[PDB]
Amino acid sequence: MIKIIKNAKVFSPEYIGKKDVIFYHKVIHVGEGVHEIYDANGLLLLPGLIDPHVHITGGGGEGGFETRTPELKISDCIRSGVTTVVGCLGTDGITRSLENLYAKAKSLESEGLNTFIYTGSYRVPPVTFTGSIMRDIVLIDKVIGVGEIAISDHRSSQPTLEEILRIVADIRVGGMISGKAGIVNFHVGSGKRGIEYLFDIIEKTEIPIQHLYPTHMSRSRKLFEQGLEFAKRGGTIDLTALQPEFTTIDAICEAYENGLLDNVTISSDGQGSLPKFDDNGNFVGLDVGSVSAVWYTIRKVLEKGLPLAEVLKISTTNPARVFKLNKGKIAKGQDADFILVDEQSFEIVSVISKGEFLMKDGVMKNLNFE
Amino acid sequence: SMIKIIKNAKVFSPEYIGKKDVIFYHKVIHVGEGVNFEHEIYDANGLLLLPGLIDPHVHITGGGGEGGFETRTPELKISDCIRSGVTTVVGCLGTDGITRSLENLYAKAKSLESEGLNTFIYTGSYRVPPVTFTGSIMRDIVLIDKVIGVGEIAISDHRSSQPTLEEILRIVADIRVGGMISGKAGIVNFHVGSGKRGIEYLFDIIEKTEIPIQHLYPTHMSRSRKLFEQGLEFAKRGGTIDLTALQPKEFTTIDAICEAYENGLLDNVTISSDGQGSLPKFDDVGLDVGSVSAVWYTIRKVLEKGLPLAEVLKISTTNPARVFKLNKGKIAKGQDADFILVDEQSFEIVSVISKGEFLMKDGVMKNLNFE
Amino acid sequence: MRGSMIKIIKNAKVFSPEYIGKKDVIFYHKVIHVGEGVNTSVLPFEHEIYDANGLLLLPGLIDPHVHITGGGGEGGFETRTPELKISDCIRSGVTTVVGCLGTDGITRSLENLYAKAKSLESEGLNTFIYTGSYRVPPVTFTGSIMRDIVLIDKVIGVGEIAISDHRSSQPTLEEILRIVADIRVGGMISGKAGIVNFHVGSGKRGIEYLFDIIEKTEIPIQHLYPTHMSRSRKLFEQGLEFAKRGGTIDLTALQPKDEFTTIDAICEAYENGLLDNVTISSDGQGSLPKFDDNGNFVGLDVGSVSAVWYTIRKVLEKGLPLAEVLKISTTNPARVFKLNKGKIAKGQDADFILVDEQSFEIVSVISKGEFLMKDGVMKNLNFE
Amino acid sequence: MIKIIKNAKVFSPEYIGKKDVIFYHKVIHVGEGVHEIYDANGLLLLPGLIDPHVHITGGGGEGGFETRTPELKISDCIRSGVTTVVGCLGTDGITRSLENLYAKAKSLESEGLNTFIYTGSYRVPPVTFTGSIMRDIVLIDKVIGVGEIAISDHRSSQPTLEEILRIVADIRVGGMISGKAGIVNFHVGSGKRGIEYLFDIIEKTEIPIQHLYPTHMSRSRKLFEQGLEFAKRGGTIDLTALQPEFTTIDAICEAYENGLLDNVTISSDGQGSLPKFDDNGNFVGLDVGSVSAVWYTIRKVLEKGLPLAEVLKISTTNPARVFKLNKGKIAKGQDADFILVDEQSFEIVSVISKGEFLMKDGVMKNLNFE
Ligand SMILES: CC(C)C[C@H](NC(=O)C[C@H](N)C(=O)O)C(=O)O
Ligand SMILES: CC(C)C[C@H](NC(=O)C[C@H](N)C(=O)O)C(=O)O
Ligand SMILES: CC(C)C[C@H](NC(=O)C[C@H](N)C(=O)O)C(=O)O
Ligand SMILES: CC(C)C[C@H](NC(=O)C[C@H](N)C(=O)O)C(=O)O
Ligand SMILES: [Zn+2]
Ligand SMILES: [Zn+2]
Ligand SMILES: [Zn+2]
Ligand SMILES: [Zn+2]
Ligand SMILES: [Zn+2]
Ligand SMILES: [Zn+2]
Ligand SMILES: [Zn+2]
Ligand SMILES: [Zn+2]
């Protein structure tokens, strides 16, 4: 149970230099000099990467039943070093069950991962477990908010201000009674209206800006600019990761320049559709998001000479704040979830979550259906 | 024993009426100058005789829970009610609609009534649409004898459901007509938070609809001078406002009351304990728990600014009895036999009488089912 | 303005059900004192005296089975009976009634029954109601016969459930046990009696269900209250066996216009010393129909609340002592519902009737200490 | 976080003699020779007492609204050394909410205790969170079964075999999908029918006897005899503790004699009514169960010269089995929940749960509303 990781260059979001880290399920003790032992010389110790937006049950289906994407194998997470995922439903609210989403999140947790879910889906009014999104967040311990509610998209339900305000108010007080944060995840399409509705709430109500969490905020110039204003008023935005004009990389730099990286987060959009529509509202082709798009994006920003100290924020501190999680920092009391990158190779070699090795030195623990 | 006489008391029929003997059963039979079947007597030499205090806003089941499940405050004991002189309470639900039962609040009102107290309740809670007993707020007031209105409906608070005007117009309409059918008052209690919109909605109702003002009963309105100034505007149009009673723990409710009395508006002011109700500092932190002690304490503190007792007692006896159309708050023939007895010198509650029975006799409390 | 709150009745021969001779009674809304002659012109404050020389003081009559909203309608929409007038009750010395629904549970609402009980309450009468009707499953205020008895003060049980009747829903034994279980535990929570009133037709099965429940379950017999048990003598003899196991049976009072009657039944229950186990009910504003042998409607009479005092007067004409006959309409109905009525004594609710000593007519009526009728004159009423 | 309890006479259900016990939130290491340290010489170390049947929200009300009992203060648990409680609803299913019961159990946990709940109440059909007792046990992580279903009582709903069989089958499969045990708690009244229905199930169906958990099985001679047969067929019974003819003490001995103590458990019936009814079904007087009735019962059996080794079974091993709990034994990996009794004084002095001291050496931690 009690474990050590000696003579690793410990990279708590800000650099804390060559130190040993003792840990059960949480960081128990830190101290330079000397149950399981693990030597990690040559490796960098980070806190486990956080993914706040992943279609863990699969998604897509904009082009029919054929375009229904596959469910997520934990196999892919561990190679990518993603130790905690927040599962949401997407465009399809009928064939993808909320109970199914509870279960996949419950199974991912039982095979070593850390899981939380939303209770909504694209459409307003939102699908529920118990008839009421407030009731869901008080009674289902894993529910941390609602989404992903579509706004300014062609696949939107066309929601009104008053409808939405109901939801936010219900989910917020839902939070307070239950002692959770109570987030609203906001799928933002390519409509000109953008995130107007989000400004309305904070301007015209008693609603704090912490509860509003818009995603895909990197997909255009225009929209990222709105994402920065929203940031500058004390709110946090989320950017969809880059994965094989203007990219998610340029944006994550453009936030450092204007001094706003403390308000950014990245999403894999794993197992989610990446659809291409023509001149009308017809469907042309698709791609499928990969949960290894996080670590891939991190390295392509370091490639531009940003400090690894202030890039790990987007995936470790910045997300853990948004959801009020006891994770995302290597320090006494915090939950014990780390990844280990080799020197200047820049490749994950080991992965720890809740103090159990899921990947040790490039050999994966074996899982039930692989 | 069940026909009683209080002798040699200086009586405050709210208004002062000098030294008088009161004869009562469950209601007052006679008030006259010294005179004399088995009947009990109580010599009240040295004592003042006042009406029973009325508390229009108490979370008798418990409330709060806004800081998580750890914030769940405990339920009201009647013990407090007897030592603090409160013979009548009106129970309501708060921010938690899901885990605090309406049906639980009906049962809590029934146990307290049954150990010598007087109880009424509101249906619903903070959230719009409001939780009901029977699917309909108009049905509830008609069918369940203790429901006297709806609340506390949250306007201009961060924990508000963000209600529209249209929603609130149906709600007050429904409970008003429901009030008429049942022969009760049909009050909407409004929880007013610290939002800039204040009570704009209440003004919107009287300015653009047929709905009388007597149904709109805003509470918490000594939280800022700005709100109170908008409260007084309301008072001048026939409305009644509730002030949260100062507790044993700028601009205060004591300030607030004297400002009202000096404008000749103390007839339009009441005070609530908000007992067992959460009192949290919410910043952009901490919590404390209201006591029913808060009203008699607040009465003294305003007496200490030199206001005449008979005129002050109106905020807790005459003015609540009016708003809920109750047969209480006045010592007279036909009125309900609810009295407190305070030492004239000490000014500390020594005996409390509810429905003509002694709940406390010279400091010695009646003993109850779980003490 | 209000009427003098302390009253005294002097020089009456008091039938506190049990005879207690010439006594004065001081009262407000409850009975304050029973005692020998005492100086009643010594009080310094208001007090209305009433001289009752030559009259008999008795408790207020309780009528446990009344269609206060109207009922009937077995012969089409033309056979719906009118609703009860409080002047009927005042003339008949009936100070308390318990109202129920019957055959029609489609066009007679429970909310309408709740209102009429409250309007009766407010003119000087004491009122209670049942939830449900004839049919199984039973109609409800709130969706459940348990919520109704817990949330609605005036609700004291469910009925009248139709068993051994052509108009019955043909209820199952499992259906009925669920219903009696629900209303009892409901009574326990709300501190009421939790009664199931049974409307018993003329089926061969009689009350087999009532005997099935007591013999095969822990449900005590206090909660099973069957009515119309003088219908046929076969049914009345099934009633007596029910009595000897601690039960209470209700008989429909003899009607002032028309062989084995409820008089025969009452006298047989005295003979066998089981008079503590019977009640009588007017079935006022109820259908009293005739069906031919094919099951079709022929015609009907309408029950009357005058039936109670009328029935008691017949029984007296057969030499039974007054002090023991009054049980059926005072002590016995007060038991079944756990009411603070039916006896003249310190503490008890001040519901009286006064009868002339030879005439044996009701001349004055007092409920809540208030005179509804004083010396044959009624008080002014709301819609009369 | 890491704690030791040195030179205590460690009384793992069976005696393991003077040993040190290291423990975070679970028993981490056991070893004789030598972060917080606690010396416990003179004291006996036991595993934390288990209460499988407590009306944590209050109950009673058979005699009106006046007879409604008060809610349970954690203050009383800690003095009594009761570290884990299973909350149920009783006779009243209307005024006592299931949401209220979730919350009180949630609050007791947040102030140091360990809590689980049922989803039913006396009446059949049973009240639910989500419309369906199966759905409740899959979706509400704290739900471990259904009860307390009344059988052979005057306050019974009069349930049929077929109705009940539905429930048991639904709760069982509910268990399997969710990876919980899925118990049916059975309030048994003083009816002659007794637990007949329980024999029917195992005789006439494919239903395993582990799911059937009858309570109050000590209240009569006749019924305890039925409790022993049920035991002898591989099932477990529950006895209502003794607290100030034939008692719960005689019975717990009578199980040792016939060699059946491995199939017994004790309940406080805390905050529950103990009602007295006369000749008919009317109510006379009441008493209110106390959660300190457990430890009080334990000592009055030791008074009869039974080994403390084989008496702690009823409150530690026997209950933890029934509910499939990682508790009730002092040994590596088990959750860290202990009580400390002084020499031959026989009085709790300290109480530990999840490795946090709730009572240290007779001074209680201070709690929010005391
Ligand atoms: C990458 C961009 C262009 C596509 C993206 N749409 C979705 O991701 C669809 C949704 N996740 C699903 O599962 O169906 C967008 O926000 O614009
Ligand atoms: C004047 C202040 C103290 C009013 C207000 N209090 C609450 O909202 C308490 C809530 N109604 C409950 O009891 O559940 C506040 O502090 O914001
Ligand atoms: C005694 C006989 C003739 C009348 C009785 N019918 C009813 O009581 C009708 C029902 N209660 C109603 O009015 O809706 C019966 O047939 O047994
Ligand atoms: C001790 C025995 C005699 C009484 C016991 N009844 C209950 O405990 C009632 C239930 N817990 C409640 O909360 O209402 C029994 O099983 O026989
Ligand atoms: Zn999206
Ligand atoms: Zn998406
Ligand atoms: Zn408030
Ligand atoms: Zn309040
Ligand atoms: Zn009938
Ligand atoms: Zn009838
Ligand atoms: Zn029980
Ligand atoms: Zn119990």
Numbering used by the authors:
A (entry chain D), D (entry chain D): 1 to 34, 43 to 252, 261 to 386
B (entry chain C): 0 to 35, 41 to 253, 261 to 295, 300 to 386
C (entry chain A): -3 to 254, 261 to 386
The authors write:
In the present study, we functionally characterized the hyperthermophilic M38 β-aspartyl peptidase FiBAP, a protein repair enzyme involved in hydrolysis of isoAsp residue-containing peptides in F. islandicum AW-1. The overall structure of each monomer can be divided into two distinct domains; an N-terminal β-sandwich domain (M1–G56; G344–E386) and a C-terminal catalytic domain (L57–K343), that are mainly involved in dimerization and catalysis, respectively.
Crystal structures of the ligand-free form of FiBAP and the ligand-bound form bound with N-carbobenzoxy-β-Asp-Leu (Cbz-β-DL) as a substrate analog were determined at resolutions of 2.6 and 2.7 Å, respectively. Cbz-β-DL-free and -bound structures belonged to I422 and P2212 space groups, with one and four subunits in the asymmetric unit, respectively. Intriguingly, the crystal structure of FiBAP bound to Cbz-β-DL included distinct electron density only for the β-DL moiety lacking carbamazepine (Cbz) in the active site. There is no significant perturbation in the coordination of the binuclear zinc center in the Cbz-β-DL-bound FiBAP structure. However, structural comparison of the residues around the ligand-binding site reveals subtle changes of ~1 Å in the side-chain conformations of some residues (G68, E70, Y130, R163, R227, and S289) between Cbz-β-DL-free and -bound forms. Residues such as Y130, G68, and S289 are placed closer to the ligand than those in the ligand-free structure, thereby assisting coordination and stabilization, while R227 and R163 move away to provide space for ligand binding. The other surrounding residues that help to stabilize the bound Cbz-β-DL are the amino groups of main-chain residues S289 and G68, while T99 interacts with O04 and O05 atoms of the side-chain of the Asp residue of β-aspartyl leucine to stabilize the N-terminus of the dipeptide during substrate recognition.
